[PDB]
Amino acid sequence: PPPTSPPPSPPPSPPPPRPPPPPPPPPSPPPPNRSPPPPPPASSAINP
């Protein structure tokens, strides 16, 4: 007899485990230091 046909081929292997997740970004930098107010106008003279 002719050589018997080979057994069926196995189904495709499963995909490797999917990668882990990224890490949360470092704390966002604080706001800019707001500048101070301006000095009051030159005051008048004290009462006599």
Ligand X SMILES: *[C@H]1O[C@H](CO)[C@H](O)[C@H](O)[C@H]1O
Report whether 47 belongs to an annotated binding site.
no
Residue type present at position 1: P
Shortest reach from residue 47's CB to ligand X, in Å: 36
CA–CA separation, 23 and 18 (whole Å): 16
Two tokens at 7?
A: 């057994």
Q: Which of residues 10-39 bind ligand X (CB under 6 A)?
A: 10-11, 13, 25-26, 28, 33, 35
Report whether 44 belongs to an annotated binding site.
no
| Residue numbering of the annotated binding site for alpha-D-galactose | 3-5, 7-9, 11, 13, 26, 28, 33-35
